């Protein structure tokens, strides 16, 4: 279990996600974007499972539901993430 906080840029958070097929399936980090927020922070790794985003658990949420959570964060604001390896 790892805990990071990333700042939202116009270019996003710098990572991509896969999974979240159905609401009982989990989501994972596929890729990190060159010199984007996530990669520069150095804590997130591909394959990492997303457990929570800002105090709230995303494990019961679909892929679009979690993408809407990341896209609904204004530029300059930061999210707290808990991921498991």
């Amino acid at each position: 279990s790892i805990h990071t906080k990333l700042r939202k840029s116009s270019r996003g958070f710098g990572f991509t996600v896969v999974g979240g097929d159905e609401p009982d399936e989990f989501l994972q980090i596929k890729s990190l974007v060159l010199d984007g927020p996530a990669a520069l922070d150095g804590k997130m790794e591909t394959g990492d499972v997303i457990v929570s985003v800002n105090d709230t658990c995303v494990l019961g949420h679909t892929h679009a539901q979690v993408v809407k959570i990341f896209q609904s964060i204004p530029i300059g604001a930061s999210v707290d993430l808990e991921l498991c390896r």
């Binding site: 996003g12 958070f13 991509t16 896969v18 097929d21 890729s31 896209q71």
Partner: peptide
Amino acid sequence: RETQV
């Protein structure tokens, strides 16, 4: 299913 955020 790979979405860049």
